[PDB]
Design a binder for this molecule. Structure first.
Ligand SMILES: Cn1c(=O)c(-c2c(Cl)cccc2Cl)cc2cnc(Nc3cccc(CO)c3)nc21
Ligand SMILES: CCCCCCCCCCCCCC(=O)O
Length: 449
């Protein structure tokens, strides 16, 4: 029953324990939701995140084994590699089905790993092995059917998200004196949000403070309440709150690269190619699929409200969320002012919002991504937007945008909200979109034309 650490973890919450990647551990038990476990190492005993470690008898211990990663995600991971960079992944839908993804001369080759009647694994029928590791080791020395050898495991660059800072049940409150406030973020577009350092861990964070005469208190507290319940890799994560006395604080993880809109407008388009844009759009759809299933609506989905972290990780800002049984409608009080270009027709006309109006906004966000941040509805005056949309006018396909991506945009922009796809359908559509050629290849066909 031994485990090995897959990522480094530094102790700071006094009941937590520091571990080093590759070190062995004995697990004693789990916390209330299984997300943390009490472990013993040669250095001590304490709580560590459960997914930062794995059984010594598990495939995850191998640097090249990335588990449940999709074909498209694999192409993103390997976009930063070289000839011979590779990884082994498993199908999320159908467990047990694995494939090798390998980079060679700027292209990624995908190979299904076959299993014989006696359980042996192989890519080439002439070379079968008892275990996955033996198969990889064999192809690490001779290509034997593959375009080239498997030489460089794709790095696992991102530590798994930890939903909070403690293994204990509800321990959100923290000491304001342990927070050093720094400069405001976003030039004020997000309100009173500042970069800060959480001394106790010398950890950089984002802090929203309830200064007098700004946000209404009930609103601020509801936001804090909602955020305690949100747990998804692509939604900004809450780390703590200071609600014992003013100024109230909401403290979250810090996204280092700012918002997606600015990132796309200022990026190196060589580095941030179509496979990277697809990777980011997919992450956003995953976050929205979660809100959809958890009965929340966003109402402000746009690239300026998506934040970018390391290795193109993208998280949707989750301030302002509203609780709404998925299928019901939320009505805004007349007079509410909305960002017209991202607002669905039923919202513009009747102030009605639902997860379907978020689907419409996602379509506009997808167009912003595909254009590297262009302002929507170019060549059109806002006063005529609703009228034009009613006549079935929709933005034109962005230069180089693959046809299937634009069709998804058009599905999101169906006039009747019930005709639009769900976020579950949208996420699944991205994952199955380029199965017989890469997005890179499709962009080519679109341009060459
Ligand atoms: C702008 N903003 C927020 O509003 C929240 C946040 C908070 Cl503090 C409370 C509740 C909900 C959210 Cl989304 C979290 C957050 C985290 N990271 C960042 N990073 C960021 C934003 C703009 C510019 C830069 C570059 O210095 C870096 N910006 C963030
Ligand atoms: C999910 C997002 C996928 C959309 C990707 C669109 C990529 C467009 C690339 C445009 C090609 C550059 C043309 C040019 O400037 O000469």
């Amino acid at each position: 029953n031994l485990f090995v650490a897959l990522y480094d973890f530094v102790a700071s919450g006094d009941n937590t324990l520091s571990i080093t990647k590759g070190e062995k551990l004995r697990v004693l038990g789990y916390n209330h939701n299984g997300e943390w476990c009490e472990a013993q190492t040669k250095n001590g005993q304490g709580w560590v995140p459960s997914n930062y470690i794995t059984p010594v008898n598990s495939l995850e211990k191998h640097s090249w084994y990335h588990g449940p990663v999709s074909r498209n995600a694999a192409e993103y991971l390997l976009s930063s590699g070289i000839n011979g960079s590779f990884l082994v992944r498993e199908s999320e839908s159908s467990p047990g089905q694995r494939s090798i993804s390998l980079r060679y001369e700027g292209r990624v080759y995908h190979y299904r790993i076959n299993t014989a009647s006696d359980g042996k694994l192989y890519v080439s029928s002439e070379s079968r092995f008892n275990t996955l590791a033996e198969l990889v080791h064999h192809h690490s020395t001779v290509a034997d059917g593959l375009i080239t050898t498997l030489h460089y495991p794709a790095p696992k660059r991102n530590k798994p998200t930890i939903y909070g800072v403690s293994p204990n049940y509800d321990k959100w409150e923290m000491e304001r004196t342990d927070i050093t406030m720094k400069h405001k973020l976003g030039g004020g577009q997000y309100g009173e949000v500042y970069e800060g350092v959480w001394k106790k861990y010398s950890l950089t964070v984002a802090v929203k403070t309830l200064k007098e005469d700004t946000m209404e208190v009930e609103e601020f507290l509801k936001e804090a309440a909602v955020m305690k319940e949100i747990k998804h890799p692509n939604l900004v994560q809450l780390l703590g709150v200071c609600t014992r006395e003013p100024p109230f604080y909401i403290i979250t993880e810090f996204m280092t690269y700012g918002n997606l809109l600015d990132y796309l407008r200022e990026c190196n388009r060589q580095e941030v190619s179509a496979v990277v844009l697809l990777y980011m759009a997919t992450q956003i759809s995953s976050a929205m699929e979660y809100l959809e299933k958890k009965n929340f609506i966003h109402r402000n989905l746009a690239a300026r409200n998506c934040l970018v972290g390391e290795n193109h990780l993208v998280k949707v800002a989750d301030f302002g969320l509203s609780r709404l049984m998925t299928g019901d409608t939320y009505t805004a009080h007349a007079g509410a002012k909305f960002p017209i270009k991202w607002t669905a027709p039923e919202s513009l006309a009747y102030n009605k919002f639902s997860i379907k109006s978020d689907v419409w906004a996602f379509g506009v966000l997808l167009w912003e991504i595909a254009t590297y941040g262009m302002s929507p509805y170019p060549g059109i005056d806002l006063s005529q937007v609703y009228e034009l949309l009613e006549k079935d006018y929709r933005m034109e396909r962005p230069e180089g945008c693959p046809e299937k991506v634009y069709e998804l945009m058009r599905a999101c922009w169906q006039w009747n909200p019930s005709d639009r796809p769900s976020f579950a359908e949208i996420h699944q559509a991205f994952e199955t979109m380029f199965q017989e050629s890469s997005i890179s290849d499709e962009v080519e066909k679109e341009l060459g034309k």
